[PDB]
Amino acid sequence: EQLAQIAAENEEDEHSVNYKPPAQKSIQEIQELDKDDESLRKYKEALLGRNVPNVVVTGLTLVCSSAPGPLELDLTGDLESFKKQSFVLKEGVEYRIKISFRVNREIVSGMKYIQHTYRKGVKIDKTDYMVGSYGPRAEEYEFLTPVEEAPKGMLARGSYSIKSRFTDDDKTDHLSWEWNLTIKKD
Amino acid sequence: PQAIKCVVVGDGAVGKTCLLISYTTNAFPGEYIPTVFDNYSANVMVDGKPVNLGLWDTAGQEDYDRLRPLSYPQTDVSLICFSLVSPASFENVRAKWYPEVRHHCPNTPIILVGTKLDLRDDKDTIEKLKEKKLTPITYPQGLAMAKEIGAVKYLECSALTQRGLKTVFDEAIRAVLCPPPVKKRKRKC
Numbered sequence: 001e002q003l004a005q006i007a008a009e010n011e012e013d014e015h016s017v018n019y020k021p022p023a024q025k026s027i028q029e030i031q032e033l034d035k036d037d038e039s040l041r042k043y044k045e046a047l048l049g050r051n052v053p054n055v056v057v058t059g060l061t062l063v064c065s066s067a068p069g070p071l072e073l074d075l076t077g078d079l080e081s082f083k084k085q086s087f088v089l090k091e092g093v094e095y096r097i098k099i100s101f102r103v104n105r106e107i108v109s110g111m112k113y114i115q116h117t118y119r120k121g122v123k124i125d126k127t128d129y130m131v132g133s134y135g136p137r138a139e140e141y142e143f144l145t146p147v148e149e150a151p152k153g154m155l156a157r158g159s160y161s162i163k164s165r166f167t168d169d170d171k172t173d174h175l176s177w178e179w180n181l182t183i184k185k186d
Numbered sequence: 187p188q189a190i191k192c193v194v195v196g197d198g199a200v201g202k203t204c205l206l207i208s209y210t211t212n213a214f215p216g217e218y219i220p221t222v223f224d225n226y227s228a229n230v231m232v233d234g235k236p237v238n239l240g241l242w243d244t245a246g247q248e249d250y251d252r253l254r255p256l257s258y259p260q261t262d263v264s265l266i267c268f269s270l271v272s273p274a275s276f277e278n279v280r281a282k283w284y285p286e287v288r289h290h291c292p293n294t295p296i297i298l299v300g301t302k303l304d305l306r307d308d309k310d311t312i313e314k315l316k317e318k319k320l321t322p323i324t325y326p327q328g329l330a331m332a333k334e335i336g337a338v339k340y341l342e343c344s345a346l347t348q349r350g351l352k353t354v355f356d357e358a359i360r361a362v363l364c365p366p367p368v369k370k371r372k373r374k375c
């Protein structure tokens with residue numbers, strides 16, 4: 001429908017907290033810190049344990065509690081396909097995203113999922129999903145985003161352009177791509 | 187029972203370790219006190235139901251600024267601690283901890299805790315402090331700081347005399363068990 005107004009997703013509607021990202025320190029530098037302090041070691045062990053970049057997003061899964069079957073995206077390799085792939089999602093449904101990743105060498109500080117929504121070259125939203133900090137390990141990690149509700153659409157029932165990326169406090173660009181989502185009725 | 191994970195942050199020497207030890211053992215440790223109290227879950231029965239409270243003590247040193255946050259994922263309640271007889275650590279709640287905890291734990295209840303309640307009256311304390319143009323932290327002050335970082339409750343306690351130390355963890359659990367209804371944020375458009 002006519003969308004001349006939508007260029008104004010209200011104010012940012014933000015509440016960013018002034019947080020200074022942590023200086024860059026390596027796990028080795030971390031364990032060689034206070035090595036005479038037993039408790040610290042138990043503390044570091046309780047938290048870390050015992051051709052690839054540091055982080056690798058395996059896939060996003062859309063946890064929808066209405067229509068059977070999963071809903072995933074294989075964030076591995078060929079991503080151009082997403083630009084011609086079409087995705088639908090019923091109106092105002094209760095959903096949540098399941099981000100699954102894997103950390104390899106160092107620590108990921110403040111990893112986050114940023115999702116810009118577009119409707120004719122008009123960013124009508126910027127949502128940030130704080131995933132968190134994690135240590136390296138073989139077992140992948142899985143993080144569920146808070147419960148949510150898709151928009152209504154006697155108005156916003158058109159197709160949209162979606163640009164996503166995974167970054168963190170170190171402003172590292174772990175992943176990024178664009179896809180197309182559409183809101184139907186059934 | 188049900189598992190509620192609790193993390194305890196705050197400046198060094200505020201009393202986060204002695205707080206967790208005086209709570210789990212029912213006795214104040216004096217001389218020997220580890221930098222970090224080992225992770226421990228305690229069985230408590232608040233409001234007629236058992237709970238598996240997982241207590242985490244961290245290292246407030248800025249030296250571990252990147253390591254510490256690895257404990258925030260999966261947390262249900264965070265306690266920002268500060269000494270009542272340390273104006274420094276107080277100012278440090280809005281400057282360091284609140285921004286840290288909130289940024290790593292959005293939509294996670296926060297409890298502000300003023301430790302060392304037993305030192306608020308002590309003569310000696312109000313002197314070496316009283317000679318630096320500094321006075322002890324008042325209750326209204328902490329209450330005000332709470333209202334400011336948006337904490338669900340303000341509590342004061344002392345590990346030494348174990349005063350009010352019981353309510354701090356009852357309130358933390360009460361904050362996770364049955365809190366107010368979220369506003370259903372991010373409700374697109």
Ligand SMILES: Nc1nc2c(ncn2[C@@H]2O[C@H](COP(=O)(O)OP(=O)(O)O)[C@@H](O)[C@H]2O)c(=O)[nH]1
Nearest residue numbers: 197198199200201202203204219302344345346
């Ligand atoms: N009077 C008094 N001293 C305390 C209390 N809690 C901790 N202390 C003392 O303060 C110092 C630092 O406390 P600690 O628990 O190690 O601080 P942390 O760095 O936050 O872990 C130690 O010498 C403790 O005996 C308290 O409630 N009252």
Ligand SMILES: C/C=C(\C)CC/C=C(\C)CC/C=C(\C)CCC=C(C)C
Nearest residue numbers: 009060062097117124151156374375
């Ligand atoms: C101002 C916002 C309007 C007009 C609503 C547009 C609809 C949006 C932005 C829906 C969001 C959809 C998702 C986050 C889908 C998640 C799916 C995967 C991660 C596969």
Ligand SMILES: [Mg+2]
Nearest residue numbers: 202203221222
């Ligand atoms: Mg400690």
